[PDB]
Amino acid sequence: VNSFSGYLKLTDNVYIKNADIVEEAKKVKPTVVVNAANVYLKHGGGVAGALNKATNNAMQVESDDYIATNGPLKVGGSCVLSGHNLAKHCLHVVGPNVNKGEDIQLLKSAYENFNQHEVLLAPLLSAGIFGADPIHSLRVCVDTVRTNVYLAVFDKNLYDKLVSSFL
Ligand SMILES: NC(=O)Nc1ccc(C(=O)N[C@@H]2c3cccc(O)c3C[C@@H]2C(=O)O)cc1
Numbered sequence: 001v002n003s004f005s006g007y008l009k010l011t012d013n014v015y016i017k018n019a020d021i022v023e024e025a026k027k028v029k030p031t032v033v034v035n036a037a038n039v040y041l042k043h044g045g046g047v048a049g050a051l052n053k054a055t056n057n058a059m060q061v062e063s064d065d066y067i068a069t070n071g072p073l074k075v076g077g078s079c080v081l082s083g084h085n086l087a088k089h090c091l092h093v094v095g096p097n098v099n100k101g102e103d104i105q106l107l108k109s110a111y112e113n114f115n116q117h118e119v120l121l122a123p124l125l126s127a128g129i130f131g132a133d134p135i136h137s138l139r140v141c142v143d144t145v146r147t148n149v150y151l152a153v154f155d156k157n158l159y160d161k162l163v164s165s166f167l
Contacts, residue, residue, distance in 0.1 A: 002119060003028050004150045010166060014142050014149050018159035021047060021123055021152040022054045025086035030150075033083055034114070034122035035059075036130065037092035039072040046129040055084040063092070075102050076109030091117060098131030107137065111144040119148045128154075138162055 004024075007015035017024070025033045036047040041063035043052035052059040062081055073079060078093040095110040096102030110125050124141065126132035134153075141149065153159040 002148075004030075004121075007150055008163060011142055013146060014151065016138075016151045016153060016159070016162065018154075018156050019152040020050075020154055021121065022050050022086070024121060024150075024152050025051070025083075026054070028121060029087060030083075030119065030121040031088045032091050032117045032120040033087035033089075034120055034125075035090050035092045036123050036125060036128070037073070037078075037094050038097070039075060039077075039094050041067055041073070041092060047123045051086065051090070054086060058082075058084050059090065076106040078110075078113035087121070091120065091122075093122075093125060095126035095130055095132070095137075098126065099129070104132060104136075107132065107140050108144050111141055114141075114145045114149055115147055117147055119150075121150050121152065124151060124153065134158055134162060135165055138166065 007017045009015055035051050043049055043060055073094050075094050075096050078091055081090050083090045093110050093113050096106040107126050114120055124134050124137040127134040127137050
């Protein structure tokens with residue numbers, strides 16, 4: 001039994017809710033919140049900008065030190081950093097950005113990172129300003145992630161489209 005409330009169950013392990021992932025992180029304080037990161041961990045906009053702003057820029061400060069030590073992530077890769085005031089940990093996951101021409105097949109590799117964590121609060125990878133089709137992202141998520149994932153979809157209209165079109 002966990003504390004996520006008001007989710008619709010899609011499969012054995014994937015749940016979805018029309019919610020602001022920032023507000024959901026602040027209320028649940030999950031072990032893991034997933035960030036929709038880029039390889040430089042520059043949290044300027046979209047989910048990443050919203051999460052970083054909610055940490056008063058502490059996420060960005062920590063991220064800049066991480067990059068200075070380790071260099072950029074790979075598209076499809078991830079790193080675990082602090083969750084600050086939002087979660088125990090933040091899993092920064094880099095989905096391909098279609099608006100940069102990155103290979104959409106890397107989306108499955110990106111979701112595989114979720115399997116290293118028993119339970120996660122997460123957005124749909126490569127959705128929003130990353131330019132992929134959220135319905136495709138949801139399909140890859142369900143077909144790749146085996147651990148328990150609570151997806152927060154900010155847009156109500158998209159949310160109902162995702163629910164109404166789900167197989
Ligand atoms: N307090 C805050 O600013 N919160 C906050 C700000 C921005 C985002 C975001 O960019 N969402 C994205 C989006 C939008 C419209 C269609 C989408 O397919 C997506 C994917 C993303 C998602 O819904 O996961 C999420 C939360």
